[PDB]
């Protein structure tokens, strides 16, 4: 009925833990996001080439 | 000797320990009783976090002392499991987890009994007794879950 | 006695961080699905590039 102090102890601990976990999760979420952006880049680049090549191909066709 | 591990809720575990046991050992015993991985547990005594490599006697923990346990939201490694219906679930695992314990975590998360679970990675069916490390399963790898009648 | 106010403030911090952690995990799973689709795209586009440039080598050579 006044172990309040101890719960103040523990809650402060939980907060600190949860923030850490949030940050860890956010860290992973941002890294994957970068890994995703790269893939999109690559896709874009590849599309570029296959439409450049193809365009040149159509110049040779008659 | 006995120690008591209480949580914010009030749930209290009793453990048989030795003063020379480490905080890692106490966490392993708590995993044996409650199924909580040690990298998801914080132990507190006298208002401070206990470090895994120290012993109970290192921290002045005598018999029938009481520690406090706070559960983490996540551990150090997650993998993804994709279902036939296209659902993605995320699992807390350890590199030494057996495939059987991965299936048990899937049961916890999704309710599928392990005997119905078939996990596939890199085109290979995973054997129950082997670990994630045995198959070179890394963080954020994707397993594929299929249900099967283990008898056709 | 005012530590009940602080305790409740801390409980709010707890639930808010928990919700945020979940937002981040949700986004992580979405991005895993995105990445698998993108790698599929990458493989198919690499094949397309190979075949189209071999076709063009049949001409300018």
UniProtKB/Swiss-Prot annotation, chain B:
The modification Phosphoserine is found at residue 65. Keywords: ADP-ribosylation, Cytoplasm, Isopeptide bond, Membrane, Mitochondrion, Mitochondrion outer membrane, Nucleus, Phosphoprotein, Repeat, Ubl conjugation. Ubiquitin is encoded by 4 different genes. UBA52 and RPS27A genes code for a single copy of ubiquitin fused to the ribosomal proteins eL40 and eS31, respectively. UBB and UBC genes code for a polyubiquitin precursor with exact head to tail repeats, the number of repeats differ between species and strains. For the sake of clarity sequence features are annotated only for the first chain, and are not repeated for each of the following chains. It comes from Homo sapiens (Human). Changing residue 72 to G: No effect on ADP-ribosylation. Belongs to the ubiquitin family. It comes from the Eukaryota. Changing residue 44 to D: Impairs ubiquitination by CRL2(KLHDC3) E3 ligase complex. Impairs ubiquitination by CRL2(KLHDC3) E3 ligase complex. One of its GO terms (molecular function) is ubiquitin protein ligase binding. There is a cross-link at residue 76 (Glycyl lysine isopeptide (Gly-Lys) (interchain with K-? in acceptor proteins)). GO terms for biological process: modification-dependent protein catabolic process; protein ubiquitination. Changing residue 74 to K: No effect on ADP-ribosylation. Residues 1-76, 77-152 form the Ubiquitin-like domain. The keyword Coiled coil does not apply. This is Polyubiquitin-C. The chain holds residues 1 to 152 of 685 of the full protein. The record marks 68 as: Essential for function. There is a cross-link at residues 6, 11, 27, 29, 33, 48, 63 (Glycyl lysine isopeptide (Lys-Gly) (interchain with G-Cter in ubiquitin)).
UniProtKB/Swiss-Prot annotation, chain C:
Ubiquitous. Strongly expressed in peripheral blood lymphocytes, spleen and skeletal muscle, and is weakly expressed in the brain. In peripheral blood mononucleocytes, isoform 4 is mainly expressed and isoform 1 and isoform 7 are almost not expressed. Expression of isoform 1 and isoform 7 increases in leukemic cells. Changing residue 20 to N: Abolishes binding to polyubiquitin ('K-63'-linked and linear). Residues 1-58 are annotated as: Ubiquitin-binding domain (UBD). Disulfide bonds: none annotated. It comes from the Eukaryota. It is found in: Cytoplasm; Nucleus. Interacts with TNFAIP3 and IKBKG (polyubiquitinated); facilitates TNFAIP3-mediated de-ubiquitination of NEMO/IKBKG. Interacts with polyubiquitin. Interacts with MAPK1, SELPLG and PIK3CD. Interacts with IRAK1 (polyubiquitinated). Interacts with MYD88; the interaction is indicative for participation in an activated TLR-signaling complex. Interacts with HIV-1 matrix protein. Interacts with TAX1BP1. Inhibits NF-kappa-B activation and TNF-induced NF-kappa-B-dependent gene expression by regulating TAX1BP1 and A20/TNFAIP3-mediated deubiquitination of IKBKG; proposed to link A20/TNFAIP3 to ubiquitinated IKBKG. Involved in regulation of EGF-induced ERK1/ERK2 signaling pathway; blocks MAPK3/MAPK1 nuclear translocation and MAPK1-dependent transcription. Increases cell surface CD4(T4) antigen expression. Involved in the anti-inflammatory response of macrophages and positively regulates TLR-induced activation of CEBPB. This is TNFAIP3-interacting protein 1. It comes from Homo sapiens. The gene is TNIP1. The chain holds residues 453 to 513 of 636 of the full protein.
């Amino acid at each position: 009925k006044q172990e309040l102090v101890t719960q103040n102890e523990l809650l402060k601990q939980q907060v600190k833990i949860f923030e850490e976990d949030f940050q860890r999760e956010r860290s992973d979420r941002e890294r994957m996001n970068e890994e995703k952006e790269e893939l999109k880049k690559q896709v874009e680049k590849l599309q570029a080439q296959v439409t450049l090549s193809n365009t040149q191909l159509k110049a040779f066709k008659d | 000797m006995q120690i008591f591990v209480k949580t914010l809720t009030g749930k209290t575990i009793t453990l048989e320990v030795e003063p020379s046991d480490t905080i890692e050992n106490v966490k392993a015993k708590i995993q044996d009783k409650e199924g909580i991985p040690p990298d998801q547990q914080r132990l507190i005594f006298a208002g401070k976090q206990l470090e895994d490599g120290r012993t109970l006697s290192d921290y002045n923990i005598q018999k029938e002392s009481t520690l406090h346990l706070v559960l983490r939201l996540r551990g150090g490694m997650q993998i993804f499991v994709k279902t036939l219906t296209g659902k993605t679930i995320t699992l807390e695992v350890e590199p030494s987890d057996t495939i059987e314990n991965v299936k048990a975590k899937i049961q916890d998360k999704e309710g599928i009994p392990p005997d119905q679970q078939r996990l596939i990675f890199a085109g290979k069916q995973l054997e129950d007794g082997r670990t994630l490390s045995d198959y070179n399963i890394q963080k954020e790898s994707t397993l594929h879950l299929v249900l099967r009648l283990r008898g056709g």
